[PDB]
Target: ADP-sugar pyrophosphatase
Amino acid sequence: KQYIISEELISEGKWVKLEKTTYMDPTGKTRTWESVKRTTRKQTADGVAVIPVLQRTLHYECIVLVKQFRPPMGGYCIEFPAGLIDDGETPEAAALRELEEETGYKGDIAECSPAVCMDPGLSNCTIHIVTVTINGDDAENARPKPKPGDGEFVEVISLPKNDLLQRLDALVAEEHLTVDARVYSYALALKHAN
Amino acid sequence: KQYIISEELISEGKWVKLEKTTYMDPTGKTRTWESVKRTTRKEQTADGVAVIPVLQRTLHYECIVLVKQFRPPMGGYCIEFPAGLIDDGETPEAAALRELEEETGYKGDIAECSPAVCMDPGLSNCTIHIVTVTINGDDAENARPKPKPGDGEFVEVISLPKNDLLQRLDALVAEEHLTVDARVYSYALALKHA
Ligand SMILES: CC(=O)N1CCC[C@@H](C(N)=O)C1
Ligand SMILES: CC(=O)N1CCC[C@@H](C(N)=O)C1
Ligand SMILES: [Cl-]
Ligand SMILES: [Mg+2]
Ligand SMILES: [Mg+2]
Ligand SMILES: [Mg+2]
Ligand SMILES: [Mg+2]
Model:
């Protein structure tokens, strides 16, 4: 019933652009929506986000997260490891690559979501959510080597999966951080399950 | 270590703007970032709310109430938690219960309310509160719920069992062209992983 008629470029940067989208509403009435898009998409989605399950025997299972300064937020955020998919890269490969660069961990793919939207009222940004296990007892993950790209400055924070939401709330209460909505949602459902 | 040096408007629409953010990196080097922000945020603790609406009924499995809407940024239909922007002076809880009633017809009860969480912190400053709400589907108020859509709102309600949420979303995605929201997928994934 609803569909895009046209788009009008308002402003284009190097990495983001702002458009005015004209669309048909289900009554037959024409309407406008201010939308953001990345300039970098060519493949399945803009980015991957990695749910990294760190498994060590005789230890609680942890979810590995990253803390970074985020210029659009003006502050530090706690997030799933993540990045944009390179031209000609698969989402699985992007996930394992980003996880290694941001955490130094080498993991195995468990599952891969379809393209899911980040903020569909605002942008067309999509990611693949990629669940990865990390065998923390394997020699390669003994002393994990984070390989930042130029301009990345990433702290690794591993939290127990069993208490994830309480631990995130605690970091927020002490550290003045912002938790990512996908991280929080996952933490919530861990608590809400069964 | 890192902080914002300056924020330069690049282009301001009615609803969304693009800014050039100058910031200090942790090596002591000045860098820039293209950032998206809404123009609508006043004194609210966040831009918006998303509602995790748990529909409870005697002799029923618990459902998660979702909505399906055309999203002009995406050029297509998206399946999301019920959500909207917080009105000036409105609390996150009031916003959540109001949006839930507008979008689904259901009259909920507050369970919990997250801190402000970031939507896509590498792109925008946008934040939500994620508000968990239970819906007593045995109350006569919630018997034959009618959405009260606002001007230009066109919302379908989809309630799926919590105990099968990821597979049921996968089956909706296999049947038509639509995108599941990343927070919904994240929460469906945790329900599997727990
Ligand atoms: C409620 C909302 O998100 N609004 C109103 C309609 C236009 C939208 C836009 N231009 O992006 C903003
Ligand atoms: C790695 C990446 O996606 N970057 C490059 C640095 C500038 C950033 C921006 N302009 O939003 C985007
Ligand atoms: Cl797993
Ligand atoms: Mg990253
Ligand atoms: Mg990276
Ligand atoms: Mg809405
Ligand atoms: Mg609404």
Remarks:
- The domain at 1-194 of chain B is CATH 3.90.79.10 (Nucleoside Triphosphate Pyrophosphohydrolase).
- DSSP finds three helices and twelve strands in chain B.
- The pocket of (3R)-1-acetylpiperidine-3-carboxamide (ligand 1) is lined by residues A 33-34, 121; B 15-16, 85 (CB under 6 Å).
